[PDB]
C-alpha cells in the first residue's frame, strides 16, 4: 500500500502529490502527511533523498571530514600533540566505504520516515497529465494515475554541462564522479571555483592530488560571498597547496593517448593562451533546474530564462493548485532552502501563513577552515546604498581556537550605522557552519549587535569570537583583541 | 609614590582582567593587581585552558590509537603517546594566552601591579610583593575579583604528588596505572576522561547519585554516564570516601562506603584526584577590618550593581554567588564597570550556559526537568537523537540527543539540554534563544544550514512545539 513500484498500477487518490524526494520534496511530503493530507511522493531514482543525500551534501561532507582527519594524522598536527605514528597510509576504498555507509543509512531512513508517516511512495517518473492528475511511468513500462487536489513540483537540479567537454565520469567527471574516484589523481583540474568545486578540490588536495581550480570570475566561493572573506579564504587555501587561476576561461579539453587531459585556457577577457595538463578533470561550473518531461509546456507553465518555474509567495505556479519549491525555483540552490520552502508551502496548503526571509538563509563551505555567512555582504550593502559599520574578531585571539592550534580566519559583523541592527554575519574559520545558525536566529528577531554582545556565551568556545565581533561593531572595541 | 586610580581590580582571572580592560575602555584610570607570576587566574593557568587542551589532545590520541581512524581508511602501524610533548602543547597554549592578557593590558593602558593586594582603607589598596616591598594605590573604587581555590577534603591532605587537585592532575609526568577521582562533577569527569583515554584505569567515586554536578538534567546525566562507562570510565555513585592513606610504597589506600552507610571497602591507586568542589578565595584581603562579612559559604554578598555594603567596593566572579564559571565572571565584570559608569546592569543567570568538554560533550542552559517539577511549572518535552542528524551520521559520531523543555501555555523555551557532538558550541545558540525569550516554534522556523548538528536543536524545538519532528 505505502510502496507503489513496478506492477502496482491501480489508480490512486491524494490530497497532495509531491514529485521528487530531495530535501524539498521528502520533507514537504512528511509534513503534509503530519498536517493530515493524504500524501503521495513520486521518485524516479532507486533511492529517496535526491541530490543532497545521494550525490551531494552527504557524501561530500563525509569525504571532507575524513580527508581533514587524514591531513591531521599525516601532516604536522598530530605530532605536535604527542601522538607519534610510524607510517600514515591512505586506504581510499575504506574511506569511500565510510562515505557509502552514511548515504545508505540516511536514504533508508527516509524510507522509514515515509512509512512511519503513511506517505505513499510511488517509484516512477511523474508527469503532470492534467490540472489534477499525475501519471507515473515505471521501470517496466507500466503507468499509474494519481488523481490529486494539489501538486507540488520538487524535481530539483542537474549538473550544468560545459559545451564541447563531455562528462563521462571516468577521467572527465562531474561532482558525482569526483565523489567516487578509485584512486587519488596525481593532478586534477577543477573548472569552477564555486562552493562545490572548492570543497571537492580540497578533498583531493588533502589526499595527495595536485589541484588547480580555473574560474571565469574574479573570486572563489560563488555568488554573494563577501569579497574580503573570499580573498582571505583563497589565500588560506593557496597556503594549503590549492592553486587558483581566476579571471580565466576554459576553451576546450582533449583526452590524450597517455590517458591524461590537456585543458586549453586563456584570460577571461582574451589572450594569454595556455595549456594545463591533468589526470582527472572535474567540471563544476554550475547546476540548473530539472523539469524534463514534466508536462509544463502542455499545462502552459512557462519557465524563466534560467529554467526556473516562476512561483508566488505561496509557491503557487500560475496554475493555483500546482506548486513548486527548491532547486527548481529561484533563490539559492541549497538543501535547507528547499526544505524550508517545502514546509511553508504545505503549511500554506493547510491554511497557514507563508513567509520566508531569504535574507536569513545561511550559506556554508565545509572546507577547513569553514566559511559561512548569512544576510548581506559589504558589496551588497554598498550596492543598496545602506550605511553600515564593521566589527571583526580574529580566531587567533579566541581561546578555544588557540588552545586547539586552529586559528585561521575571523568573524566579521556588518551593522547598520545608526541603528546597530545586524545586517550580515560572515565567518571564516573553525566551526563556521554551526556558528552561522546563531546568526540566523539573531537575524530572525531583527537583533542588534548590542543584543548579541549581551548574550552570555560559554567560555572557551569559538562562539565567543562571534560575540566579540558584535561587541566591536556595537561599542567600537572588543575585549580580547 | 602612591598610584592614584579610578578603579583598582584585585585579581586577573576572567572576571578581573576583563573588568580591568573594560573599565579602561570606559575611560577609568585602571589598575589590576595580581599576586601570581602570570595573569589570567584559575581559568588560564590551572583551569579551563589546560583542561581543554588535554581533552582535545587525548581525544585525538584515542581516535588514532583506537578504532576510529582505521574505520575512515586512515591506517597507522604504531600509535604511541609522547606525554611530554602532549603536555608541551598544553603549556604552549597557556603561555600564549597569558602573554596575550599582558599585551591587552598594555594596549588598553591598564596598569599591572604584581603583588598580594590588601584593602587598607575605604579608598586604598596596598600590594605587597614577594620581597616585602609595597605599592600603595589610592583609588575611588575597588573591584574584588579574587576568585576561587580548591575545596579541601577533610582528613585528606593534597600534596600535588600522589594526592592531587585539578592542578596536579593537569601536569602528571606519567600516565598513572590506576587513578581514583573523588567527585564526579564537571572537573572530575573531564580530568578522569583525559587520563582514562591515555591508558589509566580510572574510577570516579561520587557521594550523590548522578554525574556532572549541580543542575544537570537527570536524563542527560544518566545517558552521559552510560556512554562514559562504555568507554571504560568506571563510577561508584552513592559512595562516600572516609579517608585515604599515603603508603610507604608510594601508593594510596582509599576507604569508601555506601553514601548512606555500610559496605566498607578499600581500593588502592597510584594517584588520587580530589575534586569535590571549589570555594571563594578572600584570604587576607582586609574584609574583616572593613566590616565586610561573608555569607555562610564564604561568598561576598553584593547588590545588583555588584557593590558590597561599602558602595565603592565591589565584587564579581567566583567570589560571589552564582555559577562558578569563567563566562559568568567575565559578564559580571563587564556589567559591574558599565554600572560604575552609570549604565544599566542586568544578568539573567538562567541564561548562563554550562559545558562539559568530554567526548561526547554536554551542554545546557535554563532549567532541568527536575527544576521545573520542583517549581511546579507545567511543561512539554521535545527530543531529537543525533543518530537521526545528517551531519552527525555523516561524521559517524552519533551519540546522544537534544532535549527541549517548553512552557505548556506559552510555548516559551524553558531549558535546552544537549548530549553529543558539538554541544559546547550549540548551547550558545540556545543561550541567545533564552535571552530573547524565544518560543520553541520560533526556533523550529529558523532556517538552519543543512547538514549541521544544530538541525538537531531545530528539530527538538519542532517536536516540543508541534508534537513531531520531521526526521525522527
Ligand atoms: C556535490 C554537491 C554538494 C552539495 N552540498 C550541499 C551542502 O553542503 N549544503 C546544501 O545546503 N546544499 C548542498 N548541495 C545542494 C543540494 O544538494 C540541493 O540544493 C538540494 O538537493 C536541492 O533539493 P531539491 O529537493 O530541490 O532537489 P533534488 O535534491 O535535486 O531532488 C530532486 C529529486 O526529484 C527527482 N525527480 C526529478 N524529476 C522527477 C520526475 N519527473 N518524477 C519523479 N522524480 C523526479 C530526482 O530524481 C531527485 O531525486 C550540494 C550539491 C552538490 C551537487
Ligand atoms: C580544572 C578547571 C577547569 C575549569 N574549566 C572551566 C571551563 O571549561 N569553563 C568555565 O567557564 N569555567 C571553568 N572553570 C572555572 C573557572 O576557572 C572559574 O570560574 C574562573 O576562573 C573564575 O574567574 P575569577 O576571575 O572569578 O577568578 P580566578 O580565575 O580564580 O582568578 C582570581 C585571581 O585573583 C588572584 N588573587 C586572589 N587574591 C588576590 C590578592 N589578594 N591579591 C592579588 N591577586 C589575588 C589569584 O591569584 C587569581 O589569579 C574551571 C576550573 C578548573 C579548576
Swiss-Prot record, chain B:
Activity regulation, free text: Disruption of native heterodimer state inhibits primary dihydrolipoamide dehydrogenase activity and induces serine protease activity.
Task: Give binding positions for FAD.
Answer: 34-43, 52, 117, 146-148, 318, 324-327
In the record, the effect of residue 436 to A is given as: Reduces interaction with PDHX. Inhibits multienzyme pyruvate dehydrogenase complex activity. Does not affect dihydrolipoyl dehydrogenase activity
Q: Write the Enzyme Commission number(s) for this entry.
A: 1.8.1.4
Q: What is its main location?
A: mitochondrion
On modification after translation, the UniProt record reads:
Tyrosine phosphorylated.
| Cofactor comment text | Binds 1 FAD per subunit.
Which Gene3D superfamilies would you find in this protein's record?
3.30.390.30, FAD/NAD(P)-binding domain
Residues annotated as catalytic: 450 (proton acceptor)
Swiss-Prot/TrEMBL keywords: Acetylation, Cell projection, Cilium, Cytoplasmic vesicle, Disease variant, Disulfide bond, FAD, Flagellum, Flavoprotein, Mitochondrion, NAD, Nucleus, Oxidoreductase, Phosphoprotein, Redox-active center, Transit peptide
**What is this protein's record name?**
Dihydrolipoyl dehydrogenase, mitochondrial
From the UniProt record, report the name of the gene that encodes this protein: DLD
Amino acid at each position: 500500500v505505502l510502496f507503489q513500484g513496478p506492477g502496482a498500477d491501480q489508480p490512486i487518490d491524494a490530497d497532495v502529490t509531491v514529485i521528487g524526494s530531495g530535501p524539498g520534496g521528502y520533507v514537504a511530503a512528511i509534513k503534509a502527511a503530519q498536517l493530515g493530507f493524504k500524501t503521495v511522493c513520486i521518485e524516479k531514482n532507486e533511492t529517496l533523498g535526491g541530490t543532497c543525500l545521494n550525490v551531494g551534501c552527504i557524501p561530500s561532507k563525509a569525504l571532507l571530514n575524513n580527508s581533514h582527519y587524514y591531513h591531521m594524522a599525516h601532516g604536522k598536527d598530530f605530532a605536535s600533540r604527542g601522538i607519534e605514528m610510524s607510517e600514515v597510509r591512505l586506504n581510499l576504498d575504506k574511506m569511500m566505504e565510510q562515505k557509502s555507509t552514511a548515504v545508505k543509512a540516511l536514504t533508508g531512513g527516509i524510507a522509514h520516515l515515509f512509512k512511519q508517516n503513511k506517505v505513499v511512495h510511488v517509484n516512477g517518473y511523474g508527469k503532470i497529465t492534467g490540472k489534477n492528475q499525475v501519471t507515473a511511468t515505471k521501470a517496466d513500462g507500466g503507468t499509474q494515475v494519481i488523481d490529486t487536489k494539489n501538486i507540488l513540483i520538487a524535481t530539483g537540479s542537474e549538473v550544468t554541462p560545459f559545451p564541447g567537454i563531455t562528462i563521462d565520469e571516468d577521467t572527465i567527471v562531474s561532482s558525482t564522479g569526483a565523489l567516487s574516484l578509485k584512486k587519488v589523481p596525481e593532478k586534477m583540474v577543477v573548472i569552477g571555483a564555486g562552493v562545490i568545486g572548492v570543497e571537492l578540490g580540497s578533498v583531493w588536495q588533502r589526499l595527495g592530488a595536485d589541484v588547480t581550480a580555473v574560474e571565469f570570475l574574479g573570486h572563489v566561493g560563488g555568488v554573494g560571498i563577501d569579497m574580503e572573506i573570499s580573498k582571505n579564504f583563497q589565500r588560506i587555501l593557496q597556503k594549503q597547496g590549492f592553486k587558483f587561476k581566476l579571471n580565466t576561461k576554459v576553451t576546450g579539453a582533449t583526452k590524450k593517448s597517455d590517458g591524461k587531459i590537456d585543458v586549453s585556457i586563456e584570460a577571461a577577457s582574451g589572450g594569454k593562451a595556455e595549456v594545463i595538463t591533468c589526470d582527472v578533470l572535474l567540471v563544476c561550473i554550475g547546476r540548473r533546474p530539472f523539469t524534463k518531461n514534466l508536462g509544463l509546456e502542455e499545462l502552459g507553465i512557462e519557465l524563466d530564462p534560467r529554467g526556473r518555474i516562476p512561483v508566488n509567495t505561496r509557491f503557487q505556479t500560475k496554475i493555483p493548485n500546482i506548486y513548486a519549491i527548491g532547486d527548481v525555483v529561484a533563490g539559492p540552490m541549497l538543501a535547507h532552502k528547499a526544505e524550508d520552502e517545502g514546509i511553508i508551502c504545505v503549511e500554506g496548503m493547510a491554511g497557514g501563513a507563508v513567509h520566508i526571509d531569504y535574507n536569513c538563509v545561511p550559506s556554508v563551505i565545509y572546507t577547513h577552515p569553514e566559511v559561512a555567512w548569512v544576510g548581506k555582504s559589504e558589496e551588497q550593502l554598498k550596492e543598496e546604498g545602506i550605511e553600515y559599520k564593521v566589527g571583526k574578531f580574529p580566531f587567533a585571539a579566541n581561546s578555544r581556537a588557540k588552545t586547539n592550534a586552529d586559528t585561521d580566519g575571523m568573524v566579521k559583523i556588518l551593522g547598520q550605522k545608526s541603528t546597530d541592527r545586524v545586517l550580515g554575519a560572515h565567518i571564516l574559520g573553525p566551526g563556521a557552519g554551526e556558528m552561522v545558525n546563531e546568526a540566523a536566529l539573531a537575524l530572525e528577531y531583527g537583533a542588534s549587535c548590542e543584543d548579541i554582545a549581551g548574550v552570555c556565551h560559554a567560555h572557551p568556545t569559538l562562539s565567543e569570537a562571534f560575540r566579540e565581533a558584535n561587541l566591536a561593531a556595537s561599542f567600537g572595541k572588543s575585549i580580547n583583541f
